Amino acid sequence: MEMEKEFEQIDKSGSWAAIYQDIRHEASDFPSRVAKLPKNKNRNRYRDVSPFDHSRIKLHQEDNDYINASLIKMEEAQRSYILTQGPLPNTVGHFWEMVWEQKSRGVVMLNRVMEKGSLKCAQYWPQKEEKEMIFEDTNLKLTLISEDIKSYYTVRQLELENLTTQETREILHFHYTTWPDFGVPESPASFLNFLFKVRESGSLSPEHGPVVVHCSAGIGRSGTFCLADTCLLLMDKRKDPSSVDIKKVLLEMRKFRMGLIQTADQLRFSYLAVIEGAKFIMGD
């Protein structure tokens, strides 16, 4: 089945929870053996969210190459994303090592450091220009260059220096600051506005390494972001736009990381974003 009509039928039939459990049922299950090794226990924020072996990002070090991060490769859309958990106090150096080694231009952050009174990720970037961070385990320096605070999001320019070679690179930090503690946003307008800013910047384009996107577990809000981007890119591209099926795109993505889209509300929000997003692109 075009979608808006379909979205409207599910609504009157109120079957979002049913659609969603169907997706949960047919999703892929691939092994995650490296994530479960005892030497990695302190590298996983949540016991139940792990990268598959086959698609995990490997750090370039002999000691321990493990980070909780996955490469989602969308062959037809010609997009790659890295989806990862929010960094832990002991994996902040691993996080920036990955950014460096994978040649990423942008980091997308969809949570606040504290939510519902509890820490959701480490404070992994510097908050003042004159107070840089140094990650001694991986030999990296990170400096705040500028900050651009808007109503719904903040964009930061950062400088990442490899101390081993003194190469530097500009990294862009795209921080969506207004996702509610519970539920999903009422309208997708601000989230779409945020997504297009990230596109404009060049951070999603094939001349750079894959964008790194995270929330607390890296599957819920993060899944919403790459699902809405890939569906819109497929709808702009094909001969017949009505042949983009958001459930099939989601199942394809779930071959590369488990659990993408954590609730039926996130599933519904995701439809609204694509519909309204496809509405904007065509003027109507």
Ligand SMILES: CNCc1cccc(Cl)c1
């Ligand atoms: C050239 N493609 C225009 C179009 C149609 C339907 C949806 C989108 Cl996003 C874009």
